[PDB]
Design a protein around this ligand. Structure first.
Ligand SMILES: CCC(=O)Nc1ccc(C)cc1O
Ligand SMILES: CCC(=O)Nc1ccc(C)cc1O
Lengths: 264, 263
């Protein structure tokens, strides 16, 4: 992988692996999300990091608030996918990381993603606005003119997501993370939540449809010793679902999301 | 990746990814097992496949009976690991696939693995001996002289594993596979079983020790809708005896052993 000529974005190629594919011999949405994370980590490393010098001094971290992914074509096993990623400040609200996925052979856009990140104190878990000193430290690595993966006016990445009301149409109960679901800091990987959301989609939908869009809001973190319930209700040739992840015990919300599926 | 000069083995390099590492910033044993599986699949593809023409005609498949992995150094995040793999017939019993793992920069061996595979009818699930016709079409892709990743006479890869007796010292119950745990044929990936075995090792062992050796026997397959209990007892470096069994009737799915070195 490498930073592009202007040093304001990063590109990387990936060959899709045998264990990374689903029933259609194409990459799962969790494989795609892991590749978005890997290209994001390589970009931060290439520019000197995603904690800045000031962030480490104040025990501050970047946490995901929202993830939005749209896939037009899933790469097949053995195919090369090229991913370009960049960041932008969104004032004092936080930062945004965007991605464009392309078929390396044709150069055609096969997917796009956008994510909203907020600043949080590592210890107290209290969110806070971005300070000017932090904003200046990462503006030298971001394009100054706006560059959006989802530029459209009424695009799906910025829509408000409602809370699923009981009873759910579908559910998958008692979901627990294992050690493979943890990152290097022993926190549950953000991609695991995408998997848990999808666990409550009925197998007949998975067998006859392909996932086109997934929007996920992150409200609270699941601990290593927490248990999760995944809930889904159809809200609709295309099928749409409303999703909710909540702790199995008290029903505390972990995530809420929406998925859009098109018939194969 | 590519077949070596003689066409009798296959090599591939991998850069260790950020999500592939554990708390020590080094590749997990499940990342290693996934890389062994990927280099195995690429080898089969490069030689024309791991079912042959005769196996497809009779609905025959290769199934894992035993996996044995020994790691001396786990590659760090960003490091390049080179893996060489080859196969060998073991008469009518089945086939063996071996691997050597190296640090790409130093050329030093950082790990090794061996696996025993048996022939099974995909429909009835009945094990069968390897026929002459199948041995013949496999032998042209295997070294004729023996080439062993674990050559030592009476090594850890060929030791008999006993059945854990109740009560277990440690346990992790109610383990269920999700869709990410399935392969392209909707069967539970063999690497998931390694993860489930390790789930019953206490966190204090994981925090103060590194996994050096894991030997795993595969007895039965876990279905998409099955629930598993993972059981561990210390038999001692720290050594453990392991058992995976269905949560309900207690039907055995796997048995294994692990050896851990103090960090
Ligand atoms: C260190 C750079 C960074 O933000 N990494 C990152 C982690 C998770 C996801 C989903 C996307 C990512 O880009
Ligand atoms: C298709 C070639 C093949 O044998 N692949 C394979 C699958 C699983 C494991 C654990 C190792 C492997 O090498």
């Amino acid at each position: 992988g490498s930073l592009t000529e202007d040093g304001l974005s990063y590109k990387e190629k990936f060959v899709v692996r045998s264990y990374e594919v689903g029933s259609n011999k194409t990459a799962t949405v969790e494989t795609i999300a892991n590749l978005l994370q890997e290209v994001g980590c390589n970009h931060a490393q290439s520019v000197g990091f995603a904690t800045t010098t000031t962030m480490r001094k104040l025990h501050l971290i970047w946490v995901t608030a929202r993830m939005h992914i749209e896939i037009y074509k899933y790469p097949a096993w053995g195919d090369v996918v090229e991913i370009e990623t960049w960041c932008q400040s969104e004032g004092r609200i936080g930062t945004r990381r965007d991605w464009i996925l392309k078929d390396s052979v044709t150069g055609e856009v096969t997917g796009r993603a956008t994510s909203k990140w907020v600043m949080m104190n590592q210890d107290t878990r209290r969110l806070q606005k971005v300070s000017d000193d932090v904003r200046d430290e990462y503006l030298v690595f971001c394009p100054q003119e706006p560059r959006l993966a989802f530029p459209e006016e009424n695009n799906r990445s910025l829509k408000k997501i409602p809370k699923l009301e009981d009873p759910a149409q579908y559910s998958m109960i008692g979901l627990k993370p294992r050690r493979a679901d943890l990152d290097m800091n022993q926190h549950v990987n953000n991609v695991t939540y995408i998997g848990w959301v999808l666990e409550s989609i009925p197998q007949e939908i998975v067998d006859t449809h392909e996932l086109q869009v997934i929007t996920l809001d992150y409200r609270r973190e699941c601990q290593q010793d927490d248990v999760v319930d995944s809930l889904t209700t159809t809200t609709s040739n295309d099928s749409q679902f409303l999703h909710l992840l909540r702790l199995s015990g008290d029903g505390q919300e972990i995530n809420r999301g929406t998925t859009l599926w098109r018939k194969k």
